[PDB]
RNA sequence: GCCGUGCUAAGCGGGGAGGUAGCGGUGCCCUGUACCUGCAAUCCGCUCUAGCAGGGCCGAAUCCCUUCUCGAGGUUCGUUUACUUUAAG
RNA sequence: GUGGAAAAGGAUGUGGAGUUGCUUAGACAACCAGGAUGUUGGCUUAGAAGCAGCCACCAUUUAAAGAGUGCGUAAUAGCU
């Protein structure tokens, strides 16, 4: 449940994704990070489910270090209506994710338990995913 | 061979030991007099008795020294020791008492020396947190 | 860590011959066993020395090269001494006995079960419960033993029916 | 791998000042037998006798080549090594002979160990 | 059997056998017997 | 101890397919002439083996142990009837 | 029968390119031996001693025994 408390315009374009991420190409703040390889939309519920997976498995840590925040609203028309007559109502929020984006960062937890936590939470996201460690 | 930690209180009835004495092939009541005669030398304690049956159907009974930390409860004054490890420490035992307890089991133990014996009693006492002075 | 290039030897008085390119016939004191392989293998018989030779070392050539030496060695002690599988049967009324050249079982069923050995592999009853199969080839002895076990496989709740000599069976408690 | 070289050279330093040794085969290692043997050698003599068992050919030839090149028979299998600096054994060797012959496992009917020169009938 | 398209060893006694085109597992515990597809 | 005055309690059935190296019990047979409600079997009270709450007991032991019994069941054999079901002749 | 229809996920399928400990002072397996003592770890079960858990992480000569990974009504067995 991650919410921008105020937005200029509550309806905006769906946008196009292509190419790698502009920033967040390296894990810098924690010591083990997780990376996206394929670009897609990731929602509030997916961020929250991954965070509950990581925190509840590790039961300890410095902190969780979510590295993306959803700002894009997406809209839906009400069900079974003739298509047109204006853009629909805002339904939820989406963090746009390009490849080469670190999604979650981990510090202070050892090798195999960090590997297990990140696998357990990367199974809860729709995108193909790779582990990474800090240089 | 079987082991039985027979106390000095009661060795007669069937609910405590029963078939452990029954299935050995030796009469249970026939050796209770010898068991009580051996126990009355060290009465007030729990003596382990090993019962061994040879190939010639001969029965041998060997009594041994009582287990460790039996006198530690009497030195503490509390019958049941602290079940929480190493933070509830009531029993403060002098090293003279530790040396006496080791000296009582110089024949029974297979430890090398008195230093090995005080290491043995440290390893036993560290489970319930008994202070050795 | 290799079983393929180790050496196997005829222990005593067991005759071996190669009558066709990859058909080997072995006559020991008990009987004669003859088998046929694909021609990619190579077998050479020195006096009390058997050597195997593969043309190339690759994934399934390694497998066949190992298994032909294992097979020939296993059948040569089989033709040397024969081989035993014992079968116990556990139950208060379960019975198995010998009827002529056949074996009869009565375990749970209204009809008795008949086993007819045809390949000259013997079955004997030293006791009512213990039964033994004795034969030349490990494959056929295992097949007959499995055929006896399939009459009644052992059941988990009470140890019952046919079982092997020393294997463990699963114990499930029924309340 | 050089820790092997340290334990080799300290065992050479032990066996150089070692005067006598006794054949013990490390098979049939039953607990009552080995505890009674160790307690009775504690009774008989000092603790100088060792429980070391490693008998690979890199060890025995390296011990033999400086002194006592008779370890070819003790090369295979497993033979524990006993070191005796204090008092010449005689009644101790007779004790080993009698408790090997009156049950309590065998020693190979005296394989022999070269104290200065000994191959046969260490008594 | 457990016909599941995800087959992984549950307990450490399990070992995987590549059999007939379907990667099964076999274990002493019969509950841990499964085969994909 | 002749006994009398104010009062009691251990205790008021077991055996034999039973359950824990564990007693009681809601099949079964017995003497019953010894009391009643509940819990208690793909189960409950429960551990010197007494099933757990109260009361009907003059009230202490003839009812706590000892030849004081055969007998009412659990048995390798029953070649001694004979029935009944599958088959070596 | 891919070619000649399709995903998250699963795998000792297989061909290439690497990295890393053992690597003949004898490795990984196989077989033969070893598996104890304080100590039956407490304390609720007069049953638990690995058969539930407040719970330690000792020392012996061991480079072998951890107060323990396993048939086991609860220990006691060919057993790992």
Swiss-Prot record, chain A:
GO terms for biological process, alphabetical: translation
Cysteines paired by S-S bonds: none
GO MF entry, a single one: tRNA binding
GO CC list: cytosolic large ribosomal subunit
InterPro entries according to UniProt: Ribosomal_uL16, Ribosomal_uL16_bact-type, Ribosomal_uL16_CS, Ribosomal_uL16_dom, Ribosomal_uL16_sf
Organism superkingdom: Bacteria
UniProt-listed Pfam families: Ribosomal_L16
Keywords: Ribonucleoprotein, Ribosomal protein, RNA-binding, rRNA-binding, tRNA-binding
Keyword Lipid metabolism (UniProt): no
Similarity section: Belongs to the universal ribosomal protein uL16 family.
NCBIfam families linked: rplP_bact
Subunit structure: Part of the 50S ribosomal subunit.
Function: Binds 23S rRNA and is also seen to make contacts with the A and possibly P site tRNAs.
The name this protein goes by in its record: Large ribosomal subunit protein uL16
Protein's organism: Bacillus subtilis (strain 168)
UniProtKB/Swiss-Prot annotation, chain B:
Xref: Pfam families: Ribosomal_L11, Ribosomal_L11_N
Top-rank lineage group of the source organism: Bacteria
Entry PTM: One or more lysine residues are methylated.
SUPFAM superfamilies per record: Ribosomal L11/L12e N-terminal domain, Ribosomal protein L11, C-terminal domain
Gene knockout outcome: Depletion gives a strong growth defect, a ssrA deletion and rplK depletion is synthetically lethal. RqcH is no longer recruited to 50S ribosomes, no change in RqcP recruitment.
Biological process, per Gene Ontology: response to antibiotic; translation
GO CC, one annotated term: cytosolic large ribosomal subunit
Keywords, alphabetical: Antibiotic resistance, Methylation, Ribonucleoprotein, Ribosomal protein, RNA-binding, rRNA-binding
GO MF annotation terms: large ribosomal subunit rRNA binding; structural constituent of ribosome
Cystine bridges: none
Quaternary organization: Part of the ribosomal stalk of the 50S ribosomal subunit. Interacts with L10 and the large rRNA to form the base of the stalk. L10 forms an elongated spine to which 2 L12 dimers bind in a sequential fashion forming a pentameric L10(L12)2(L12)2 complex. In stalled/isolated 50S subunits interacts with RqcH.
More details: An unidentified mutation in this gene gives rise to thiostrepton resistance.
HAMAP family: Ribosomal_uL11 (MF_00736)
Family: Belongs to the universal ribosomal protein uL11 family.
Name of the protein in its database record: Large ribosomal subunit protein uL11
Source organism of the structure: Bacillus subtilis (strain 168)
Gene, per the UniProt record: rplK
Swiss-Prot record, chain C:
One GO MF term: structural constituent of ribosome
One Pfam family matching this protein: Ribosomal_L6
Cystine residue pairs: none
One GO cellular component term: cytosolic large ribosomal subunit
Transmembrane segments: none
One BP term from GO: cytoplasmic translation
Sequence similarity: Belongs to the universal ribosomal protein uL6 family.
Cross-referenced NCBIfam families: L6_bact
Subunit field text: Part of the 50S ribosomal subunit.
Name of the protein in question: Large ribosomal subunit protein uL6
Species annotation: Bacillus subtilis (strain 168)
Swiss-Prot record, chain D:
GO biological process: translation
Molecular function as annotated in GO: large ribosomal subunit rRNA binding; structural constituent of ribosome
Induction: In response to low temperature and salt stress.
Ribosomal protein in keyword set: yes
Alphabetical UniProt keywords: Ribonucleoprotein, Ribosomal protein, RNA-binding, rRNA-binding, Stress response
GO CC term (a single one): cytosolic large ribosomal subunit
Keyword set includes rRNA-binding: yes
Assigned protein family: Belongs to the universal ribosomal protein uL10 family.
Oligomeric form and interacting partners: Part of the ribosomal stalk of the 50S ribosomal subunit. The N-terminus interacts with L11 and 23S rRNA to form the base of the stalk. The C-terminus forms an elongated spine to which L12 dimers bind in a sequential fashion forming a pentameric L10(L12)2(L12)2 complex.
Protein task: Forms part of the ribosomal stalk, playing a central role in the interaction of the ribosome with GTP-bound translation factors (such as IF-2, EF-Tu, EF-G and RF3).
Protein name: Large ribosomal subunit protein uL10
Gene: rplJ
């Amino acid at each position: 449940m991650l919410l921008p408390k105020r937005v200029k315009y509550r309806r905006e374009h769906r946008g196009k994704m292509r190419g790698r991420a502009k920033g967040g190409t390296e894990v810098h703040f924690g010591e083990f990070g997780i990376q996206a390889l394929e670009a897609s939309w990731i929602t509030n519920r997916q961020i929250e489910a991954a965070r509950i997976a990581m925190t509840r498995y590790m039961k300890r840590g410095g902190k969780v270090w979510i590295k993306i925040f959803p700002s894009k609203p997406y809209t839906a028309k009400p069900l079974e209506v003739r298509m047109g007559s204006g853009k629909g109502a805002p339904e939820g929020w989406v963090a746009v994710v390009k490849p080469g984006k670190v999604l979650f960062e981990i510090s202070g937890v050892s090798e195999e338990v960090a590997r297990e936590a990140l696998r357990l939470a990367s199974h809860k996201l729709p995108i193909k995913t790779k582990f990474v460690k800090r240089e | 061979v079987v082991k039985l930690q027979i106390p000095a209180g009661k060795a007669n009835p069937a609910p405590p030991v029963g078939p452990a004495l029954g299935q050995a092939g030796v009469n249970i009541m026939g050796f209770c007099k010898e068991f009580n005669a051996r126990t009355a030398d060290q009465a007030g304690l729990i003596i382990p008795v090993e019962i061994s049956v040879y190939e010639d159907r001969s029965f041998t009974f060997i009594t041994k020294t009582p287990p460790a930390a039996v006198l530690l409860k009497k030195a503490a004054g509390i019958e049941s020791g602290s079940g929480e490890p190493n933070r509830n420490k009531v029993a403060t035992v002098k090293r003279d008492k530790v040396r006496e307890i080791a000296e009582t089991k110089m024949p029974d133990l297979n430890a090398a020396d008195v230093e090995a014996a005080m290491r043995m009693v440290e390893g036993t006492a560290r489970s319930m947190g008994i202070v050795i002075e | 860590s290799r079983v393929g290039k180790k050496l196997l030897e005829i222990p005593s008085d067991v005759t071996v011959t190669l009558n066709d390119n990859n058909t080997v016939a072995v006559k020991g004191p008990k009987g004669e066993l003859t088998r046929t392989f694909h021609p990619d293998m190579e077998i050479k018989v020195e006096d009390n020395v058997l050597t195997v030779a593969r043309p190339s070392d690759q994934k399934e050539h390694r497998a066949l090269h190992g298994t032909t030496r294992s097979l020939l060695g296993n059948m040569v002690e089989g033709v040397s001494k024969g081989f035993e599988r014992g079968l116990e049967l556990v139950g208060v009324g379960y019975r198995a006995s010998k009827s002529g050249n056949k074996l009869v079982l009565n375990v749970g069923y209204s009809h008795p079960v008949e086993i007819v050995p045809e390949e000259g592999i013997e079955i004997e009853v030293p006791s009512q419960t213990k039964v033994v199969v004795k034969g030349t080839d490990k494959e056929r002895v295992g097949a007959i033993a499995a055929n006896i076990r399939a009459v009644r496989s052992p059941e988990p709740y009470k140890g019952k029916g046919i079982r092997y000599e020393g294997e463990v069976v699963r114990r499930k408690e029924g309340k | 791998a050089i820790e092997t070289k340290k334990v080799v050279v300290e065992e050479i330093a032990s066996k150089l000042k070692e005067s006598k040794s006794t054949i013990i085969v490390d098979y049939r290692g039953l607990n009552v037998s080995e505890v009674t043997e160790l307690r009775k050698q504690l009774r008989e003599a000092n603790v100088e006798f060792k429980v070391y068992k490693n008998t690979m050919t890199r060890r025995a030839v390296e011990q033999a080549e400086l002194n006592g090149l008779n370890d070819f028979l003790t090369g295979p299998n497993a033979i524990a090594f006993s070191t005796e600096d204090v008092v010449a054994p005689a009644k101790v060797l007779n004790d080993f002979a009698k408790n090997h012959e009156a049950l309590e496992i065998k020693a190979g009917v005296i394989e022999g160990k070269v104290s200065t020169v000994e191959e046969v009938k260490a008594l | 059997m457990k016909v599941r398209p995800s087959v992984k060893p549950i307990c450490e006694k399990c070992k995987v056998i590549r059999r007939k085109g379907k990667v099964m597992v076999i274990c002493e515990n019969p509950k841990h017997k499964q085969k994909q597809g």
